[PDB]
Ligand binder design. Structure first.
Ligand SMILES: C[C@@H]1O[C@H](O)[C@@H](O)[C@H](O)[C@@H]1O
Lengths: 314, 308
């Protein structure tokens, strides 16, 4: 079965690591961090890895139940919540995943909305349940962030109106802050089972192996609750590529596919890239920053090549 | 002739095309009195997006634009006038043959979400809970402007890039006018909506619409509101990619349990992009979690579906 990519322009793609549209293609050859994100990880023959799942609505989302309000040193009102799988089934800690699928894969203060729909209904209200929602922050670097153990903590500005023992949903929206004290680092993984524990079942790190090459990212800018900053999240492949590769499950015929970024209105190749078996792109570029390219552009599979293939410089 | 196909995705791998939600259940309601003419999640079987439908899951019920003025509510809350652009930031051209900017909500209600702003050497930011009343006389996205309200009283900046991220509904009480089949007046109350995706309905006796249903969060109050889409967003995205020619007006599809290979039920998938089934009851369809629709063959309007 022939390998293919979807025909989607950048303006038709979304981030696989946070629910955002793709804004720009991006390189950073001088990146010092090990790149080992866990969302947006899929092999070219369609094997999801890390914490990756198919739903755009599942990325950095949680489902579970608040247990009780808890004490915490930091500002705000804090709440412990057990987490289940996104489909509501109990998360089985013995499953070979780093954490429940969809769990955030970076250090930071993730800002969003906690909402609740009570289990118990009221006869006088037409047998309908009570609801509430509030802004919330999940600090993924916190010792209380233990999604692999089945529970996490979130903070609210709201001081009281969060109910114990009721079905709870976290909808991600952005970051609370990127001040130094908020520990945003998109390449630093959470400790999924808590401080001092080793993460397990990780999707592997990715890196260029060929001289002059660097990773190519699909970049999205992420909203902020407050403060200064223009934070970005870089994914290895957009969510639609994850979904496509999973559907197709085309056999990988080598370790590296040659792909061309094409302007369809002209049919011309803007640049070429290597699409690696483990699901990431490299290009021959020696600068950092956005790739400035016509809006109609998209990647097209050209051929399977090998480790010795030399890319045309961008 | 390129063979027609549907993606192989279970219900638990699908999302709603009318609000950013996972699909929870398949659902029927034969006694529905309303005309069903939603504008998001509309796509013909040969891949033509219609209504306000666009491809991004992040675009559904989202807005992009800039705040122009603050107006205080007579009672409580603060309202903000927002000019809206296309989701890609280009100016919305009201003369384009669309009902409203693509992604615009397609129902009456108080849509709850978050407004965020990143100012035009690091930029200042703010975000707040916000509500967009799509039934409001000030909801005129086809004219390039809408209004949203905040509990926040002051900290929303004018002339700065603004994003609305939808989250759920503010309320479904009597005063909140939630009706998933009532279209907004995209240009205001005395103006006719234009360029709409057509209404959908069974045409054969004993049939009813089959919906992909999602439950939508609430900011407060009582309720268990749901949003029903005609096809999930992944089907829209698939049909658009494939652009397979439609060989009749109606495709026969089978809902299959792959683990047994057995057909659980069959359905008509109509050219304009919606399903009907032979069912005479309302409520969820109880089906194994591994189930998904598979194209069987092209049939016609007179085909008799096996009763569910
Ligand atoms: C029914 C009530 O609606 C309000 O908005 C909520 O704040 C309460 O917790 C409760 O659910």
């Amino acid at each position: 079965k022939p390998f293919t990519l979807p025909i989607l322009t950048l303006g038709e793609l979304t981030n696989s690591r946070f629910p955002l549209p793709i804004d720009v293609l991006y390189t950073n050859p001088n990146e010092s961090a090990i790149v080992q994100c866990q969302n947006g990880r899929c092999t070219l023959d369609g094997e999801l890895q890390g914490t990756t799942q198919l739903l755009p609505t599942g990325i950095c989302a949680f489902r579970g139940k608040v247990t009780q309000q808890v004490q915490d040193e930091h500002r705000g009102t804090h709440w412990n919540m057990t987490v289940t799988n996104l489909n509501g089934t109990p998360f089985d800690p013995t499953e070979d995943v780093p954490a429940p699928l969809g769990t955030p894969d970076f250090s930071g203060q993730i800002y969003g909305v906690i909402s609740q729909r009570n289990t118990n209904t009221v006869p006088g209200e037409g047998n309908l349940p009570a609801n509430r929602a509030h802004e919330a922050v999940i600090a993924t670097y916190s010792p209380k962030f233990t999604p692999k153990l089945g529970n996490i903590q979130f903070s609210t500005w709201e001081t009281q109106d969060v109910s114990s023992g009721q079905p709870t949903k976290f909808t991600p929206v952005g970051l609370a802050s990127v001040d130094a004290n908020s520990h945003f680092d998109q390449w630093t993984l959470p400790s999924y089972s808590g401080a001092l524990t080793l993460n397990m079942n990780l999707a592997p790190s990715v890196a260029p192996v060929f001289p002059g090459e660097c990773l190519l990212f699909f970049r999205s800018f992420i909203p902020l609750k407050g403060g200064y900053g223009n934070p970005a999240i870089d994914c290895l492949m957009p969510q639609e590529w994850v979904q496509h590769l999973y559907q197709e499950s085309a056999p990988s015929l080598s370790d590296v596919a040659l792909v061309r970024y094409v302007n369809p209105e002209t049919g011309r190749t803007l640049f070429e890239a290597k699409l690696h078996r483990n699901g990431f792109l490299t290009v021959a570029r020696n600068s950092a920053g956005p790739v400035v390219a016509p809006t109609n552009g998209y990647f097209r599979f050209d051929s399977w090549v090998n480790q010795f293939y030399t890319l045309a410089p961008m």
